[PDB]
Amino acid sequence: MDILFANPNIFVGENILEESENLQNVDQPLRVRGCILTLVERMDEEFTKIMQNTDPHSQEYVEHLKDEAQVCAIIERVQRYLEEKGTTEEICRVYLRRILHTYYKFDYKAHQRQLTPPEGSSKSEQDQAENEGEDSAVLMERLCKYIYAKDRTDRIRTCAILCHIYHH
């Protein structure tokens, strides 16, 4: 992801340089850009499998919960690397990944942002990236409900609406 963030489409070719470049041949540069999410998805898979099969009361279970923030941070790196033509098709899965990192959320974070005195609280450039960062998920959720009026994957629609009722 750091190499991809540094790069912006060097080695893709896109007919500006061809000797020796090309992720558009052998083939389809958008497909190659979309496959990168599908690699992250195999880490997404295995992490879920570990936290399903490790013991409920082990110290390992407490330790591996720390890695969820590291996974979620990668999803934020990926969502900030799209690219409208990858966004339209991956949005159905990205909506679900946003739901996976939301649909078991607890009170305390919502209480911190909504109940900490605004006169005393944050006034500040970094803080008002990160706070807005957290409620970006419910900003996307309100957009995604309208976006899903385009789509017919009603297993995802039914699943997402149940998660929205949990979130609300």
Partner: protein, 419 residues
Amino acid sequence: YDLTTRIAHFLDRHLVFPLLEFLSVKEIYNEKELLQGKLDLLSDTNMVDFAMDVYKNLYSDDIPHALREKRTTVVAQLKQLQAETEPIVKMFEDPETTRQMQSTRDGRMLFDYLADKHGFRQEYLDTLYRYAKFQYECGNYSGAAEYLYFFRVLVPATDRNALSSLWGKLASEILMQNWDAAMEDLTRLKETIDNNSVSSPLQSLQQRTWLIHWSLFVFFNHPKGRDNIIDLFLYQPQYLNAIQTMCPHILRYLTTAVITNKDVRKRRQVLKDLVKVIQQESYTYKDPITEFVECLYVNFDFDGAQKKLRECESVLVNDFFLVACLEDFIENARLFIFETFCRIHQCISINMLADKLNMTPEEAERWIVNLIRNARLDAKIDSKLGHVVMGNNAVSPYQQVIEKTKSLSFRSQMLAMNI
């Protein structure tokens, strides 16, 4: 509810011609002013009500909106702006446009009389289609639109053009004050919503709101329109979910139109099925004057309630909205809370009612005698302590059970003794 899931994806993306902007920085009774703004947008600009809006509190900013339409009557808007002294230097569209419209009406009017006189079926439809463009373009020319819509209405693309024409004739003649035409298109609109059209999410919602706009303001027999609107689409207090609902006001008029035209038995269903449903739960915390009426009624208070209702009368008698039956509402609000209070009561002092409502104790006694005279209260009245005393403690339930259990079974045995 089905149609509610149709709303659920859309989320207050209603199509309204004024877009979003209404008369800003308003002072008195903010919930009423907010209600006027959502209503102005949803009625596609009212117009008439701007004068009412200014009459309650002085605002300059109808001028604002009022300058930007010409088809109310060009001369009226021009006189309104030049009375203010708005120095527009932009009033040049109308002499060209109106002159094209004059040539267009007379060069239609010659065909109007030929097509009627000949009666030919193609010619009448062609003359109607040649007319339909003109009356859409200017309905000011109101009686010309009414003559056209008296006969056929329908043009090749039927549903949209007929339904927009019914809304436009209903809107124009409500503004012009031609009630019989407005009563005709209130009737014609509720007939037309059966079939329906494509019924794409927002269309059905706009049709619900148009039914609210003609029903709301009260000219003639609006309690019949209250009966027609509530059981139409099955009983809701606002007719939309998705949190932003605020129309706000219809339940206030609806409750009174039940109370003054029907028995209140009957307000037990209104309390469950209109007041405690989540659409009103959403509206109540957007209107404390509506909230006091319902919340005092459902908790059965005797002396916080009656003062707060009298405090509410003071705001309500300064409501400049059309409603017709204003003191009818207020007087039967006083009666209905007293009738609700007296249902389980032991005693009431005549004086203790009088001080509370600011009336004289003889006036209070004669008012209580009018509850008794109408059979809205079983009582005895103490002549020498000045207290009214109730006593419906019904000793012995057994007999009316005994009536039913042995009437059916004994006669059923007598029926058996014949074969």
